[PDB]
Design a protein around this motif. Structure first.
Motif, short mmCIF file in Angstrom:
data_model
loop_
_atom_site.label_atom_id
_atom_site.label_comp_id
_atom_site.label_asym_id
_atom_site.label_seq_id
_atom_site.Cartn_x
_atom_site.Cartn_y
_atom_site.Cartn_z
N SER A 1 -9.67 -4.48 -2.98
CA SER A 1 -9.32 -4.84 -1.61
C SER A 1 -10.01 -6.11 -1.15
CB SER A 1 -9.67 -3.72 -0.65
OG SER A 1 -9.00 -2.53 -0.97
N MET A 2 -10.15 -7.05 -2.07
CA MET A 2 -10.69 -8.37 -1.87
C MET A 2 -9.82 -9.27 -2.70
SD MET A 2 -14.77 -7.89 -1.91
CE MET A 2 -15.57 -6.83 -0.73
N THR A 3 -8.96 -8.60 -3.45
CA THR A 3 -8.05 -9.14 -4.43
C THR A 3 -6.62 -8.84 -4.03
OG1 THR A 3 -8.18 -7.08 -5.67
CG2 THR A 3 -9.69 -8.83 -6.24
N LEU A 4 -6.42 -8.57 -2.76
CA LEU A 4 -5.09 -8.19 -2.32
C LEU A 4 -4.09 -9.32 -2.52
CD1 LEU A 4 -6.05 -6.41 0.93
CD2 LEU A 4 -5.39 -5.30 -1.13
N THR A 5 -4.53 -10.57 -2.50
CA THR A 5 -3.61 -11.66 -2.70
C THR A 5 -3.21 -11.80 -4.15
OG1 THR A 5 -5.40 -13.19 -3.06
CG2 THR A 5 -4.60 -12.93 -0.84
N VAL A 6 -3.98 -11.21 -5.05
CA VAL A 6 -3.70 -11.31 -6.45
C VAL A 6 -2.52 -10.45 -6.75
CG1 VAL A 6 -4.54 -10.88 -8.67
CG2 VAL A 6 -6.03 -11.83 -7.03
N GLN A 7 -2.52 -9.25 -6.23
CA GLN A 7 -1.37 -8.41 -6.49
C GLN A 7 -0.20 -8.80 -5.61
OE1 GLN A 7 -4.37 -7.12 -8.46
NE2 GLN A 7 -4.58 -6.40 -6.35
N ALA A 8 -0.42 -9.20 -4.36
CA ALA A 8 0.73 -9.52 -3.54
C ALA A 8 1.57 -10.64 -4.14
CB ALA A 8 0.28 -9.93 -2.16
N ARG A 9 0.94 -11.62 -4.77
CA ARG A 9 1.68 -12.73 -5.33
C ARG A 9 2.44 -12.41 -6.60
NH1 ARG A 9 -2.63 -17.18 -5.92
NH2 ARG A 9 -3.94 -15.34 -6.19
N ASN A 10 2.23 -11.24 -7.16
CA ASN A 10 2.92 -10.87 -8.37
C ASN A 10 4.07 -9.92 -8.08
OD1 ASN A 10 1.72 -12.11 -10.89
ND2 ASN A 10 -0.01 -11.74 -9.54
#
Ligand SMILES: *[C@@H]1O[C@H](CO)[C@@H](O[C@@H]2O[C@H](CO)[C@@H](O[C@@H]3O[C@H](CO)[C@@H](O)[C@H](O[C@H]4O[C@H](CO)[C@@H](O)[C@H](O)[C@@H]4O)[C@@H]3O)[C@H](O)[C@H]2NC(C)=O)[C@H](O)[C@H]1NC(C)=O
Ligand SMILES: *[C@@H]1O[C@H](CO)[C@@H](O[C@@H]2O[C@H](CO)[C@@H](O)[C@H](O)[C@H]2NC(C)=O)[C@H](O)[C@H]1NC(C)=O
Ligand SMILES: *[C@@H]1O[C@H](CO)[C@@H](O[C@@H]2O[C@H](CO)[C@@H](O)[C@H](O)[C@H]2NC(C)=O)[C@H](O)[C@H]1NC(C)=O
Ligand SMILES: *[C@@H]1O[C@H](CO)[C@@H](O)[C@H](O)[C@H]1NC(C)=O
Ligand SMILES: *[C@@H]1O[C@H](CO)[C@@H](O)[C@H](O)[C@H]1NC(C)=O
Ligand SMILES: *[C@@H]1O[C@H](CO)[C@@H](O)[C@H](O)[C@H]1NC(C)=O
Ligand SMILES: *[C@@H]1O[C@H](CO)[C@@H](O)[C@H](O)[C@H]1NC(C)=O
Ligand SMILES: *[C@@H]1O[C@H](CO)[C@@H](O)[C@H](O)[C@H]1NC(C)=O
Ligand SMILES: *[C@@H]1O[C@H](CO)[C@@H](O)[C@H](O)[C@H]1NC(C)=O
Ligand SMILES: *[C@@H]1O[C@H](CO)[C@@H](O)[C@H](O)[C@H]1NC(C)=O
Ligand SMILES: *[C@@H]1O[C@H](CO)[C@@H](O)[C@H](O)[C@H]1NC(C)=O
Ligand SMILES: *[C@@H]1O[C@H](CO)[C@@H](O)[C@H](O)[C@H]1NC(C)=O
Ligand SMILES: *[C@@H]1O[C@H](CO)[C@@H](O)[C@H](O)[C@H]1NC(C)=O
Ligand SMILES: *[C@@H]1O[C@H](CO)[C@@H](O)[C@H](O)[C@H]1NC(C)=O
Ligand SMILES: *[C@@H]1O[C@H](CO)[C@@H](O)[C@H](O)[C@H]1NC(C)=O
Ligand SMILES: *[C@@H]1O[C@H](CO)[C@@H](O)[C@H](O)[C@H]1NC(C)=O
Ligand SMILES: *[C@@H]1O[C@H](CO)[C@@H](O)[C@H](O)[C@H]1NC(C)=O
Ligand SMILES: *[C@@H]1O[C@H](CO)[C@@H](O)[C@H](O)[C@H]1NC(C)=O
Ligand SMILES: *[C@@H]1O[C@H](CO)[C@@H](O)[C@H](O)[C@H]1NC(C)=O
Ligand SMILES: *[C@@H]1O[C@H](CO)[C@@H](O)[C@H](O)[C@H]1NC(C)=O
Ligand SMILES: *[C@@H]1O[C@H](CO)[C@@H](O)[C@H](O)[C@H]1NC(C)=O
Ligand SMILES: *[C@@H]1O[C@H](CO)[C@@H](O)[C@H](O)[C@H]1NC(C)=O
Ligand SMILES: *[C@@H]1O[C@H](CO)[C@@H](O)[C@H](O)[C@H]1NC(C)=O
Ligand SMILES: *[C@@H]1O[C@H](CO)[C@@H](O)[C@H](O)[C@H]1NC(C)=O
Lengths: 126, 52, 124, 109, 57, 121, 121, 121
Positions: free
Chosen positions: F16-25
């Motif tokens: 939950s600090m990496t939410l942009t990592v999964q959202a972009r995939n």
């Protein structure tokens, strides 16, 4: 543990089928699977031009002959065995269902769906 | 690669030969054996076929 | 056992500036919010400032709001407080304290768990 | 801020009560009223937090509660080692984060 | 108290369509997506996952 | 750091600090159709999630703090365990059966908030 | 209560409490193509409406209060009739010819507001 | 005035008043497939830009003022030249090589802001 050659079935099953150099070979593997427990070994092969692919009936193909002499070198990487059988077991070459030739490579992979939403308690209020 | 009995040109097991089956005690199932080393096989059609 | 060690000068003239700092050890520094509390020589305790665990949010008591800066560096385990302008009324022992706020995804505190011994600051 | 300026006292073994009076939009509405113990010359120690809870290492001689707009700290088996100033503080909302009362000197007789 | 998060690293088993990619063929000719010459692989720390090659679609 | 799903085994509060990592995939005619179906589906799935966040009043955010109280019956745990011990995969399994309830409540509190905000104008 | 379009015959102020009900219902090669065209169209229609709400400054909302004055020439009625007597279908017919004007005005007031908010920062 | 791209040769500050003009223009089986691929692509391209604005905290806006400082190393010019002399095409070429850096910084400042706003609640 004993090895034996293939059981009766049609040529596409009882032999080692492969396509190499553009031609379809049906090799007799009885020289490989004939032992109890555990130069070179020569396996005779038959060749066909009329091929019924997979297990279908109704779609045949004619393999054009290939000009010249064919030589193929390949790596045997595995076997498909069937168990014939409580004091002894005999293993025979089997298969014929092509899915098992891919199952052996795709075994490491799984496909999953990503589900990005979720909820959890936090100590806050809008 | 499409073949029967012997699996050709696939991947190898990393360390040891492995036996995999849906059910190892069911004689109706196939057993897939993956080698950790290749066995070299040389096949040929030693005939100078012509084409027309 | 944890430690909070205040360091920094203890004597300034009014109209000047002073930087205090607080070295922390014995706990994960980055997991806690921290504050500064004054002990006037003849009185009680007064809250002065609060900083978030990540250094993003700072809060001040109105009386120092336009004068003091609170800052945090989690790589060195330190706090710092930069005083400016300074009045005689700011003479106090300044204590470094752990607590004060919370991190949202954790149980709240709103109290001070650990205290340093305090730097004494005199404004002449 | 909060108030309780007079001293508090009693003999060893007697209980004592220290009050802390605030207002509604402060100590009344927010249940975050810690208490601190300060022996002169030392930094204060946390004795009670939130309302009734104590930190590990704090004896059960220290307990407390609140009602209305007033909080209190109760000391039961009073020891000579309790001769310290006690302070109450409270979360007073956003903007005004904390306030403290003056401390009270506890005298053991 | 409920906080909604989006982009959470959660997954479920699923059956979907995969596409073919590759670096006068019978199979993949031009009807195949060109590959990434430097494909990524990410090790997942502390993840245990159940696999079943016999039920793999 | 690690990319897509690298945080999968990390605890919920580490993740939950990496939410942009999964959202972009989340972004020969027969092959064309299969590929298009895969692409249309990726778009529809994406949009259903975005629509739902919009309904709940969380449009444009990866972290959205709402006004629905947490029921102890959904998961009787303290934040310390949920955020510092558990992973997101474990959590998703733990409250799977309450997901629809929670979603329904989020929709309802937003409808009320949204109307109250109209009355204030 | 009733689901999709169940509010269609209800008055405008009785309806408009069910906005989430309708919003959620907007989401052999030849058959594959027809189905895909139907699905692509549903997506494009959805996105055109979302784009338009974004342009007007109503992104993420089902009820959006704007700053465009109502012209008595569009419909000379008091709120009591519009909201308590009329249905949405009747209303849509009544002001059909002014829809493009209203949309143009909404776009323009948003452009001005959006610029003023930049100047204030 | 002029429609789509009519502002292309105008200066940057003369342009950027027409943002809605361009935003609205972004929206036999073989022919069906080619047309669908063109349409699916238009949608995916649109959504990638919208996702990115969402990540940066600019959802729903055409003009979004952020908190990332400008580096003089990206373009050492005064606002008077950038906004009153240059066109957008010239500008895009001038800072092409810094675009990915800027995008990365925008993503990061939003993650920090978004978390700080959670801590304040
Ligand atoms: C297991 O892997 C091995 C390793 O790749 C593989 O052997 C390879 O088979 C191919 C096809 O039989 C061989 O390629 C041929 O090499 C001869 C050498 O002169 C060429 O003349 C052939 O050219 C003809 O076919 C081409 C096909 O596109 C035509 O374009 C061309 O005009 C000719 O018609 C052809 O290149 C290849 O050399 C071997 N590799 C090795 C190392 O021997 C083997 O077949 C795999 N096993 C199985 C069962 O698939
Ligand atoms: C595969 O090769 C083996 C080995 O040559 C063949 O085995 C021979 O089969 C005949 C049939 O009666 C026997 O009389 C021979 O004694 C067998 N030879 C050996 C060494 O046992 C086998 O028949 C071949 N398989 C097929 C299907 O042709
Ligand atoms: C059979 O397996 C061997 C071992 O993996 C293959 O030989 C290797 O091929 C790779 C290809 O890049 C080389 O880098 C390795 O150095 C080779 N190993 C050796 C020992 O030479 C071999 O090519 C395989 N045979 C076939 C036909 O694929
Ligand atoms: C297997 O080996 C036996 C040996 O007698 C032979 O008779 C039989 O035909 C072989 N089968 C095949 C399929 O080669
Ligand atoms: C099987 O092994 C026996 C052992 O001597 C041998 O005689 C026989 O020829 C072998 N069969 C084949 C097919 O090689
Ligand atoms: C494979 O490993 C699993 C681990 O639980 C075991 O249960 C299974 O029986 C193994 N497969 C075979 C063929 O023994
Ligand atoms: C595996 O095969 C044995 C053979 O009798 C059978 O009893 C057993 O149930 C099979 N295992 C499973 C999981 O079906
Ligand atoms: C197989 O071994 C025999 C032994 O005489 C040899 O003549 C033959 O050429 C070899 N075949 C291949 C493919 O090398
Ligand atoms: C096959 O015939 C061709 C005809 O030119 C000749 O060149 C080639 O060498 C022959 N191959 C063998 C193996 O004799
Ligand atoms: C995996 O578990 C160990 C157990 O302490 C933990 O330290 C480690 O950080 C975990 N991995 C990740 C990615 O958090
Ligand atoms: C919690 O769930 C119970 C039933 O599981 C329900 O009766 C109660 O009202 C819920 N509490 C809240 C705060 O929603
Ligand atoms: C509550 O928190 C404590 C640590 O503060 C932890 O040990 C305990 O397991 C937690 N209870 C649950 C079930 O969350
Ligand atoms: C929870 O985190 C703490 C941190 O030290 C660890 O000691 C504990 O074992 C963890 N519990 C679980 C169930 O992982
Ligand atoms: C969810 O339903 C499954 C159905 O078997 C049940 O086993 C599980 O415990 C349920 N989970 C909760 C949290 O009630
Ligand atoms: C239909 O019209 C009647 C007339 O009074 C009204 O009472 C009723 O509520 C209307 N139906 C709905 C769904 O509002
Ligand atoms: C109302 O419409 C008339 C023309 O129909 C127009 O002249 C007038 O300015 C409009 N009023 C408002 C408030 O827009
Ligand atoms: C105005 O409101 C009254 C009731 O307050 C209603 O009777 C009248 O018809 C309304 N006029 C119009 C045309 O909206
Ligand atoms: C409008 O609502 C009132 C409410 O009592 C009703 O009496 C009246 O007849 C309604 N008018 C129309 C046109 O439906
Ligand atoms: C809209 O245009 C139609 C065209 O026939 C006309 O009949 C209708 O009255 C117009 N509506 C309004 C509200 O002017
Ligand atoms: C084109 O350049 C001239 C140079 O002064 C300028 O005046 C004119 O406005 C420019 N065109 C546009 C559309 O701005
Ligand atoms: C500006 O860019 C330089 C390198 O090009 C970098 O070191 C510096 O920190 C940047 N400044 C800002 C404000 O980001
Ligand atoms: C700075 O602005 C002046 C006019 O105010 C202009 O002449 C000069 O070229 C500008 N410098 C740059 C490179 O932007
Ligand atoms: C910039 O704008 C001014 C405005 O008068 C003009 O004189 C100047 O030549 C322009 N410079 C360029 C490079 O277009
Ligand atoms: C961007 O890269 C190109 C590559 O040739 C270079 O010529 C250009 O000057 C670079 N632009 C900047 C602003 O550095």
């Amino acid at each position: 543990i004993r090895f034996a050659n293939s059981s009766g079935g049609d040529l596409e099953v009882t032999t080692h089928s492969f396509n190499c150099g553009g031609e379809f070979f049906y090799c007799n593997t009885s020289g490989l699977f004939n032992s109890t427990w555990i130069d070179s070994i020569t396996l005779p092969c038959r060749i066909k031009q009329i091929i019924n692919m997979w297990q279908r009936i109704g779609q045949a193909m004619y393999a054009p002959p290939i000009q010249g002499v064919i030589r193929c070198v390949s790596n045997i990487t595995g076997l498909i065995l069937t168990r014939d059988g409580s004091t002894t077991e005999t293993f025979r070459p089997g298969g014929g269902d092509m899915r098992d030739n891919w199952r052996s490579e795709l075994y490491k992979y799984k496909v999953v769906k990503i589900e990005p939403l979720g909820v959890a308690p936090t100590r806050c209020k809008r | 690669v499409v073949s029967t009995q012997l699996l050709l040109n696939g991947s190898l097991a990393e360390e040891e030969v492995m036996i995999r089956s849906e059910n190892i005690t069911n004689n109706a199932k196939n057993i897939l054996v993956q080698f950790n080393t290749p066995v070299q096989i040389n096949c040929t059609r030693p005939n100078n076929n012509t084409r027309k | 056992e944890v430690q909070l060690v205040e360091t920094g000068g203890g004597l300034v003239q009014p109209g000047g500036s002073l930087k205090l700092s607080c070295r922390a050890s014995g706990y994960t520094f980055s997991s806690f919010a921290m504050s500064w509390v004054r002990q006037a020589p003849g009185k009680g305790l007064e809250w002065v400032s609060l900083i978030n665990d990540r250094g993003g949010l700072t809060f001040y008591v109105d009386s120092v709001k336009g004068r003091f800066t609170i800052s945090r560096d989690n790589s060195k385990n330190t706090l710092s407080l930069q005083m400016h302008s300074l009045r005689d009324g700011d003479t106090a022992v300044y204590y470094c304290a752990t607590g004060g706020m919370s991190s949202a995804l954790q149980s709240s505190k709103y109290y001070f768990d650990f205290w340093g011994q305090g730097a004494l600051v005199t404004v002449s | 801020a909060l108030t309780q300026p007079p001293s508090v006292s009693g003999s060893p073994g007697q209980s004592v009560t220290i009050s802390c009076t605030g207002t509604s939009s402060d100590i009344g509405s927010y249940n975050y009223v810690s208490w601190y113990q300060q022996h002169p010359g030392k930094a204060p120690k946390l004795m009670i937090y939130d309302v009734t809870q104590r930190p590990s290492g704090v004896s059960d001689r220290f307990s407390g509660s609140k009602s209305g707009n007033t909080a209190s700290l109760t000391i039961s088996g009073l020891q000579a080692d309790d001769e310290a100033d006690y302070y109450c503080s409270a979360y007073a909302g956003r903007q005004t984060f904390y306030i403290f009362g003056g401390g009270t000197r506890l005298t053991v007789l | 108290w409920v906080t909604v998060y989006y982009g959470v690293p959660v997954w479920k088993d699923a059956e979907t369509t995969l596409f073919c990619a590759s670096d006068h063929n019978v199979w993949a000719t031009h009807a195949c997506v060109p590959t990434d010459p430097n494909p990524q692989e990410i090790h997942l720390e502390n993840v245990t996952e159940e696999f079943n090659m016999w039920k793999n679609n | 750091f690690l990319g897509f799903l690298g945080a999968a085994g990390s605890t919920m509060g580490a993740a939950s600090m990496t939410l942009t990592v999964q959202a972009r995939n989340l972004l020969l005619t027969v092959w064309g159709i299969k590929q298009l179906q895969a692409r249309v589906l990726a778009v529809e799935r994406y949009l259903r999630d975005q629509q739902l966040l919009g309904i709940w009043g969380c449009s444009g955010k990866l972290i959205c703090c709402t006004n629905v109280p947490w029921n102890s019956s959904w998961s009787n745990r303290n934040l310390s365990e949920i955020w510092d011990n558990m992973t997101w995969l474990q959590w998703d399994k733990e409250i799977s059966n309450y997901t629809q309830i929670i979603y329904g409540l989020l929709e309802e509190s937003q409808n009320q908030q949204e109307k109250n905000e109209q009355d204030l104008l």
